[PDB]
Ligand binder design. Structure first.
Ligand SMILES: CC(=O)N[C@@H]1[C@@H](O)[C@H](O[C@@H]2O[C@H](CO)[C@@H](O[C@@H]3O[C@H](CO)[C@@H](O)[C@H](O)[C@H]3NC(C)=O)[C@H](O)[C@H]2NC(C)=O)[C@@H](CO)O[C@H]1O
Length: 129
């Protein structure tokens, strides 16, 4: 599924991401627009072999198992396809462990380069929240 902007905002707040580890909802909404364009089914292959899965592009080198990233970890304890669902629970669940792992949202390259230090509040503009 491709989320609407306020639709995704609503469902992320529902799932506890607004101000999770200090980061406002705007940050997360901005992270998703640049990582996946709000597409839950988004996939991207990396040079090292790993693949980035879903609306928040979680990488199989570190967080999920895709059965073809040999010698990698599965720290969220899920199969990577779990992250491609229309329901974002799994991705948001795993996202909370990523952002707590020491580097904050810097783990998300598009956030560091396109959302960080910008008016991220503007991504939740007009949303009935
Ligand atoms: C959303 C996503 O999948 N992002 C990926 C990033 O997770 C990843 O950056 C690397 O992440 C790992 C795992 O968190 C980092 O290891 C951690 O590093 C911190 C210190 O920075 C350390 O305290 C933690 O103990 C350690 N984690 C574990 C489990 O030991 C690693 O440092 C990050 N490396 C870099 C260069 O940023 C990148 C790169 O794999 O990929 C994104 O897709």
């Amino acid at each position: 599924k491709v989320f609407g902007r306020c639709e995704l905002a609503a469902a992320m707040k529902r799932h506890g991401l607004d101000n999770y580890r200090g980061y406002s909802l705007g940050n997360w909404v901005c992270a998703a627009k640049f990582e996946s364009n709000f597409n839950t089914q988004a996939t991207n292959r990396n040079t090292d072999g790993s693949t980035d899965y879903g609306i928040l592009q979680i990488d199989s080198r570190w967080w999920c198992n895709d059965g073809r990233t040999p010698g990698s970890r599965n720290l969220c304890n899920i199969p990577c396809s779990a992250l491609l669902s229309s329901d974002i629970t799994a991705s948001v669940n795993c996202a909370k462990k990523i952002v707590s792992d020491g580097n904050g949202m810097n783990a998300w390259v598009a956030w560091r380069n396109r959302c960080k230090g910008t008016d991220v509040q503007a991504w939740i503009r007009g949303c009935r929240l």
